[PDB]
């Protein structure tokens with residue numbers, strides 16, 4: 525069901541954030557990303573991480589592949605269409621994911 529998709533998206537984001545913490549923010553105040561902005565943002569991090577050696581990085585790259593698909597499925601669900609480098613990439617990714625999570629309490633704009 526859709527309830528499971530929304531809950532699984534939030535749970536997967538928390539899982540990636542925890543993985544990033546293992547390699548090593550005001551409530552109500554956050555930037556707004558659209559579904560297409562969220563998708564473009566994760567694709568940039570995906571391109572960056574895939575050309576990088578590490579087993580922990582490979583796993584995060586697979587979680588991002590699931591996350592982008594969930595976003596496309598959420599976009600379809602509301603009748604709309606979307607179509608050391610490592611250290612700084614993971615650190616930036618974590619901040620971006622915490623921003624996405626904070627606005628997932630509502631169905632985002634397309």
Ligand SMILES: [Ca+2]
Pocket residue numbers: 589593
């Ligand atoms: Ca896919």
